[PDB]
Short mmCIF file of C-alpha atoms and ligand atoms in Angstrom, two decimals:
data_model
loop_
_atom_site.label_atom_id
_atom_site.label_comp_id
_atom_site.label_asym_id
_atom_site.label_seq_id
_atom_site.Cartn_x
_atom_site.Cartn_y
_atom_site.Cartn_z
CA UNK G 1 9.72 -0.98 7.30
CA UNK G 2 11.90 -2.24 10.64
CA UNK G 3 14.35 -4.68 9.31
CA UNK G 4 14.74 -5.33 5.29
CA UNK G 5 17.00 -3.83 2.63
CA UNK G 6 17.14 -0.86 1.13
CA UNK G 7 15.97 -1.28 -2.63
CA UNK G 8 15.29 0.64 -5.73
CA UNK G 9 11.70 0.85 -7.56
CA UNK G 10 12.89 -1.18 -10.27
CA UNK G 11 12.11 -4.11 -7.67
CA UNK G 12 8.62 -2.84 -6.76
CA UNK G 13 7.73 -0.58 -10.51
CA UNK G 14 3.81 -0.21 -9.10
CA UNK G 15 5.04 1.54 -5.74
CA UNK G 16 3.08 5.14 -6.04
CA UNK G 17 4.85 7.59 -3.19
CA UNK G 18 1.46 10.27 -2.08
CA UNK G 19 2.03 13.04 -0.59
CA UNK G 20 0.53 16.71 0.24
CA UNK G 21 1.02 20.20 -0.47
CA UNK G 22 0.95 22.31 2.38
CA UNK G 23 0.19 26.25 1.92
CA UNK G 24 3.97 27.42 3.15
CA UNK G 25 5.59 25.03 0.58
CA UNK G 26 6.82 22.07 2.14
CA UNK G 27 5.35 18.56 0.68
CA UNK G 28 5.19 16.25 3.18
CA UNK G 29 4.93 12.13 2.87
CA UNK G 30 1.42 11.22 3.31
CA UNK G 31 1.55 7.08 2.25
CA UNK G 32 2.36 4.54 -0.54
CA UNK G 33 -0.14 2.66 -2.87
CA UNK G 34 -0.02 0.67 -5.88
CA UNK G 35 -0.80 1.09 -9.56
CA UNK G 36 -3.24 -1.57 -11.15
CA UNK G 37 -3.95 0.56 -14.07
CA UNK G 38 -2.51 3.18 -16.21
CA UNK G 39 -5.07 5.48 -14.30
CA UNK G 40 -5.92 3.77 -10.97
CA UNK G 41 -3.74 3.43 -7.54
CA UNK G 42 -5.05 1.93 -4.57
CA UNK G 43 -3.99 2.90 -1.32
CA UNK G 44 -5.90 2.69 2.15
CA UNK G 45 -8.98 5.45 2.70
CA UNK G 46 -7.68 6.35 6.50
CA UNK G 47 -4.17 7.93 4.62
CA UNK G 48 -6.99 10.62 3.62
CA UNK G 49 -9.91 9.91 5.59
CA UNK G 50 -8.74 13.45 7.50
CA UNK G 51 -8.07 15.68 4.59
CA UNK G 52 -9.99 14.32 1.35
CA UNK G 53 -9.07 17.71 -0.63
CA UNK G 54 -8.02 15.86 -3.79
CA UNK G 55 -6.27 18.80 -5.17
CA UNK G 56 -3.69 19.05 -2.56
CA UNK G 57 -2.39 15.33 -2.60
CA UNK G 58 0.26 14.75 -5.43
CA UNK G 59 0.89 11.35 -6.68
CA UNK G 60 4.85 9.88 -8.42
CA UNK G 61 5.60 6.82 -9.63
CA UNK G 62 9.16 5.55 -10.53
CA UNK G 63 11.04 7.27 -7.10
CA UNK G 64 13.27 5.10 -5.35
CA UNK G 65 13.72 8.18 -3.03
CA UNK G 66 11.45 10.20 -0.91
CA UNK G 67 12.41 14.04 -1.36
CA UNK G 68 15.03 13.76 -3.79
CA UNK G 69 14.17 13.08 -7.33
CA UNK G 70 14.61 9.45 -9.36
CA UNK G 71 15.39 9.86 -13.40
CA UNK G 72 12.33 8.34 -14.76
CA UNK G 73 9.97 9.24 -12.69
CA UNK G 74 6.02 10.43 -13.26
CA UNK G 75 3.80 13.33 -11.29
CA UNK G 76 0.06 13.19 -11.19
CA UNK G 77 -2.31 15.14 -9.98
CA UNK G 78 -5.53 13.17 -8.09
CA UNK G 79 -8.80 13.72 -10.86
CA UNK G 80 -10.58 11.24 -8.55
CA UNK G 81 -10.28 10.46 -4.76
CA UNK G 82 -12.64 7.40 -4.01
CA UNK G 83 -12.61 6.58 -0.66
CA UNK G 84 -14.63 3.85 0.87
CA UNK G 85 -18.38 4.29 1.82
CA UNK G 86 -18.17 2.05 4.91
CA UNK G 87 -15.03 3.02 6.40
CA UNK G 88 -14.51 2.61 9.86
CA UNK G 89 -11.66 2.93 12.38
CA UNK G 90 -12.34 1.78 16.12
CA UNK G 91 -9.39 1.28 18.87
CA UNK G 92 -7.15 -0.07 16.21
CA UNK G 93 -8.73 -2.01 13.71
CA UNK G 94 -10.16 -0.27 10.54
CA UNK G 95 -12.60 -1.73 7.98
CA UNK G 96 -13.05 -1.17 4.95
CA UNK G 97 -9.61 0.53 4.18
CA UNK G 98 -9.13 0.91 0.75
CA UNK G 99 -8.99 3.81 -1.35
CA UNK G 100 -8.69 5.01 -5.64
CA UNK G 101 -7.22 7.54 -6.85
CA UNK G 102 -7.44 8.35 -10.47
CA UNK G 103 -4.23 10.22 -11.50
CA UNK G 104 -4.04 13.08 -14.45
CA UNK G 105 -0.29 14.27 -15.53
CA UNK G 106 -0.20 18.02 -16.27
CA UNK G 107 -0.51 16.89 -20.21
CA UNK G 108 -3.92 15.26 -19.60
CA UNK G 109 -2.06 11.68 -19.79
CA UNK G 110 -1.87 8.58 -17.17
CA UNK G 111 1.03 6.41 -16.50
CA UNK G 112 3.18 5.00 -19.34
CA UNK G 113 5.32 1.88 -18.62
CA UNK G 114 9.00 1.51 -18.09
CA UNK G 115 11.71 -0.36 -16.39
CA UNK G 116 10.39 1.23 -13.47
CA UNK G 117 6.80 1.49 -13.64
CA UNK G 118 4.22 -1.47 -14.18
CA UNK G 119 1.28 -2.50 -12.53
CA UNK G 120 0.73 -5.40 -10.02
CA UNK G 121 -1.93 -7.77 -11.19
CA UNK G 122 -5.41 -7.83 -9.04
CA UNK G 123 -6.43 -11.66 -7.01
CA UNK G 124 -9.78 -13.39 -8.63
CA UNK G 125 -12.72 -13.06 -6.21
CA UNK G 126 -11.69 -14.24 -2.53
CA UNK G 127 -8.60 -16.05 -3.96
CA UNK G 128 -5.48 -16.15 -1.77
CA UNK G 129 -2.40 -17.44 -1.13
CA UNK G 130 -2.57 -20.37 1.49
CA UNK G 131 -0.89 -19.12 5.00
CA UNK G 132 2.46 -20.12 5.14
CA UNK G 133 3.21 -18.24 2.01
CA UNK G 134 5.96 -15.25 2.49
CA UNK G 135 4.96 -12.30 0.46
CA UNK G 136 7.19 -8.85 0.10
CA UNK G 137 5.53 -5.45 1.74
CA UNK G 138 7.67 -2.41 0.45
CA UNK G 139 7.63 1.63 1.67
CA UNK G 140 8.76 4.67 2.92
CA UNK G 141 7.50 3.74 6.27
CA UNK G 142 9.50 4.78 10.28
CA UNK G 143 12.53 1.89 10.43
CA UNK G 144 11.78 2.24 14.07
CA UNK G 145 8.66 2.69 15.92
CA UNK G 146 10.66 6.15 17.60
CA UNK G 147 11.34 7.30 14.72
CA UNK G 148 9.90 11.00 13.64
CA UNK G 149 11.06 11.20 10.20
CA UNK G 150 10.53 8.59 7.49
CA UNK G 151 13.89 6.94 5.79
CA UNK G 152 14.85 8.60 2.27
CA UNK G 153 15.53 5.11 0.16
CA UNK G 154 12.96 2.89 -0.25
CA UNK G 155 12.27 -0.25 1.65
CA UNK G 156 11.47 -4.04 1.19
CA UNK G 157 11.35 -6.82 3.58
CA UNK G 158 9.55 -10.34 3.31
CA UNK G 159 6.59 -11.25 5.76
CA UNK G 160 4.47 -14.63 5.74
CA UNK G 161 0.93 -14.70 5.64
CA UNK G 162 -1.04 -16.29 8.94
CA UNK G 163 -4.12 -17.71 9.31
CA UNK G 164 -6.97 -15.78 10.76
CA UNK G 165 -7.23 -18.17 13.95
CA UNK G 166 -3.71 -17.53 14.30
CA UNK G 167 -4.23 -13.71 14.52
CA UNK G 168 -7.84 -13.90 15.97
CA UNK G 169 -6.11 -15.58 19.53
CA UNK G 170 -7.18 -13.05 22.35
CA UNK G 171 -3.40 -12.40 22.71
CA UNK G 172 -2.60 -11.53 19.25
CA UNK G 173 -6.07 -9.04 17.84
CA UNK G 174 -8.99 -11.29 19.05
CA UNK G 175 -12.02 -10.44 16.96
CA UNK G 176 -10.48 -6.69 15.92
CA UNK G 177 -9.37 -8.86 12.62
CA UNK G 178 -11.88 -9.90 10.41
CA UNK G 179 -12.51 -11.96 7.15
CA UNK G 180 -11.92 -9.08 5.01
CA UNK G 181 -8.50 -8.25 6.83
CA UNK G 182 -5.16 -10.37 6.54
CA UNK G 183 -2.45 -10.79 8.95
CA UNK G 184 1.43 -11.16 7.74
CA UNK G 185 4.30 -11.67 10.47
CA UNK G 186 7.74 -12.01 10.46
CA UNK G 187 8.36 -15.78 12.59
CA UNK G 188 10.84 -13.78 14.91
CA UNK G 189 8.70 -10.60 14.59
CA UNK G 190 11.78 -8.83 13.46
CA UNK G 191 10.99 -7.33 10.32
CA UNK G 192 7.28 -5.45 9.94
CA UNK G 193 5.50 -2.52 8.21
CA UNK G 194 5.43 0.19 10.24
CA UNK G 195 3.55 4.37 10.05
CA UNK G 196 4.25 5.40 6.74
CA UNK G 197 3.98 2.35 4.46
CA UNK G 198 0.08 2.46 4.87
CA UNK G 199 -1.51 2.25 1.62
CA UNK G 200 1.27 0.34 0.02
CA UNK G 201 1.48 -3.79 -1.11
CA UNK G 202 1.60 -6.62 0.30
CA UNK G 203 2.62 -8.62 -3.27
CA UNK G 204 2.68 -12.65 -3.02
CA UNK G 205 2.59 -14.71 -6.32
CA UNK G 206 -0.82 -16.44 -6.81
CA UNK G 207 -1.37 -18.18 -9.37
CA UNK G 208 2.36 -17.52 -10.79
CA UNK G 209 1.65 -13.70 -11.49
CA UNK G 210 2.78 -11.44 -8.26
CA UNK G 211 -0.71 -10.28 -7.07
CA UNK G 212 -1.66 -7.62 -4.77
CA UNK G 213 -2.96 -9.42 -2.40
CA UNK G 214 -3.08 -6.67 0.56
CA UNK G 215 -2.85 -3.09 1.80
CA UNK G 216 -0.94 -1.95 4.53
CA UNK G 217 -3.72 -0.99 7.23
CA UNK G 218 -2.64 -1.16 10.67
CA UNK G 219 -0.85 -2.81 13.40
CA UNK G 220 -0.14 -2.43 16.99
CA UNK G 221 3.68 -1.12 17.20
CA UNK G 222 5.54 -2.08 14.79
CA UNK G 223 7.88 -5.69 15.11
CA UNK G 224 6.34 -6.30 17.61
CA UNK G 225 5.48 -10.08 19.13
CA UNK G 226 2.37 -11.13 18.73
CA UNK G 227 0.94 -8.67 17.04
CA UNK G 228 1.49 -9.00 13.19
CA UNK G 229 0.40 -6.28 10.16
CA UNK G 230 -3.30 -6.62 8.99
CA UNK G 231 -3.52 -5.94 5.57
CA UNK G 232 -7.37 -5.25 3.72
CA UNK G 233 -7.95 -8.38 1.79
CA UNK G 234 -8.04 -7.06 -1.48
CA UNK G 235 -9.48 -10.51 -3.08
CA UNK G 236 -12.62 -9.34 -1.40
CA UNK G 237 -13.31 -5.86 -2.42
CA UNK G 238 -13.07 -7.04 -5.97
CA UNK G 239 -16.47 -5.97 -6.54
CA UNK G 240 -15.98 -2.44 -5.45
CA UNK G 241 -13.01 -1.72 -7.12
CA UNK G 242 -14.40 -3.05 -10.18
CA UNK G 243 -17.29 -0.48 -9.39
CA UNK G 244 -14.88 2.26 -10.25
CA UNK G 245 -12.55 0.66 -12.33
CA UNK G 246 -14.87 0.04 -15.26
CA UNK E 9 6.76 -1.46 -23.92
CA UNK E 10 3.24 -1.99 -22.43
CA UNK E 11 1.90 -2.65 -19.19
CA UNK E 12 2.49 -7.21 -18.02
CA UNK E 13 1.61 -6.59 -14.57
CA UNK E 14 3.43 -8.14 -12.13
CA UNK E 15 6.25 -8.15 -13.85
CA UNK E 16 9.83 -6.50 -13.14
CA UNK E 17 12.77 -6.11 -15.58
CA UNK E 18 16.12 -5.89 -14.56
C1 134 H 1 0.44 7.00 7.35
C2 134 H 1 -0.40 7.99 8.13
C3 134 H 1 -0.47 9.29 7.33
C4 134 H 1 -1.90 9.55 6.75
C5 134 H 1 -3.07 9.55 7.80
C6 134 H 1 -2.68 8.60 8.90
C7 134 H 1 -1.81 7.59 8.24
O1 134 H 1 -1.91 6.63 9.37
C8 134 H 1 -1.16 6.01 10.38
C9 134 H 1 -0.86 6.77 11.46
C10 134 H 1 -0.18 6.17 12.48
C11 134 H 1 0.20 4.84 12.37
C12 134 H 1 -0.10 4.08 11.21
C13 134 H 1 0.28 2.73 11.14
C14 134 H 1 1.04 1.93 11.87
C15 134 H 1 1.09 0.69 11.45
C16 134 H 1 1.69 -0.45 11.89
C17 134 H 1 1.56 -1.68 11.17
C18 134 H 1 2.19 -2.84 11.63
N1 134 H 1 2.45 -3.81 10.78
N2 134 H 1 2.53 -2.95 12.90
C19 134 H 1 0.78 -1.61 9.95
F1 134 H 1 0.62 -2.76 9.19
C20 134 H 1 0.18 -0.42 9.54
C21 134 H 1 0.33 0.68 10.34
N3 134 H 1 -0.08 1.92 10.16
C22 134 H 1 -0.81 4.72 10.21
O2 134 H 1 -1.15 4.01 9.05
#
């Protein structure tokens, strides 16, 4: 995140921190998702498109920090990596990019809730907030574009949602951004996702419940002008998720 | 106590 506050999950309790074991022993940041069940995250299918080896991926929930630990928190292992058939990544855009993981602690058990974990409620079919609304994106994600190392405290900043002609202008993505993608800017294109908090929320309140309403997917630089975050538009995979989320 | 989605408690 460029811009925001620093924050602690109790603000965001269905942040999931992924990362991967390397053989060596270091465990390296890989990206954030969500939890919308006790055994489901979502996160975007290009954060493993290049290594799906499930059983090298390790999943926490309640960590306000990245390599130090948080009291509270929960460690999964990935039973299930579902990645989307139909994925597709061209000079910047990417389609299709969502991704499940199914999550198994060492006891056989999924998430249990506390003061700092709790799922984030999932849209209706194609329902969204109008533009103009000004949803919070939170991660682990580079402060600056620069940046080679990701911050240690997690990160929150505010965004608003624009419309698709808005982001569609040949001087913002053109036709890169489609129907099933969402744009959110900062007005003075201060404040942005940036590497690193792929796979994480994009929460608004819809409906008065704070609903995922997209995924971090990609960008071009981060803060920068004209060019906002698009965000898979989660009100339309419904279907899919529901597919594996039976 | 049990999973209200979208909601935080502080
Ligand atoms: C986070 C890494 C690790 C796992 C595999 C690649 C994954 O992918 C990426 C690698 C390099 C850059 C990004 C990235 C930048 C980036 C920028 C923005 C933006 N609002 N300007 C965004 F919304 C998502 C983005 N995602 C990104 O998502």
């Amino acid at each position: 995140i460029i811009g925001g506050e620093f924050t602690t999950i109790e603000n965001q309790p269905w942040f999931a921190a992924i990362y991967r074991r390397h053989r060596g022993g270091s465990v390296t940041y890989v990206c954030g998702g969500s939890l919308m069940s006790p055994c489901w995250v979502i996160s975007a299918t290009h954060c493993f498109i290049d290594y799906p080896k499930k059983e090298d991926y390790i999943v926490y929930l309640g960590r306000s920090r990245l390599n130090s630990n948080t009291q509270g928190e929960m460690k999964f292992e990935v039973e299930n990596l579902i990645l989307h058939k139909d994925y597709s990544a061209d000079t910047l855009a990417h389609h299709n990019d969502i991704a499940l993981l199914k999550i198994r602690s060492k006891e056989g058990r999924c998430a249990q809730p506390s003061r700092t974990i709790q799922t984030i409620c999932l849209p209706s079919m194609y329902n969204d907030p109008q533009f103009g609304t000004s949803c919070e994106i939170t991660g682990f994600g580079k402060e600056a574009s620069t940046d080679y190392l990701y911050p240690e405290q997690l990160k929150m900043t505010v965004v608003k949602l624009i419309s698709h002609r808005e982001c569609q202008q040949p001087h913002y993505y053109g036709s890169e951004v489609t129907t099933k993608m969402l744009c959110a800017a900062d007005p003075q294109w201060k404040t942005d996702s940036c590497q690193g908090d792929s796979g994480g929320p994009l929460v608004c309140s819809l409906q008065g419940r704070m609903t995922l309403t997209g995924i971090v997917s990609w960008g071009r630089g981060c803060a920068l002008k004209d060019k906002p975050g698009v965000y898979t538009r989660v009100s339309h995979f419904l279907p899919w998720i529901r597919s594996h989320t039976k | 106590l049990k999973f209200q989605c979208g909601q935080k408690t502080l």
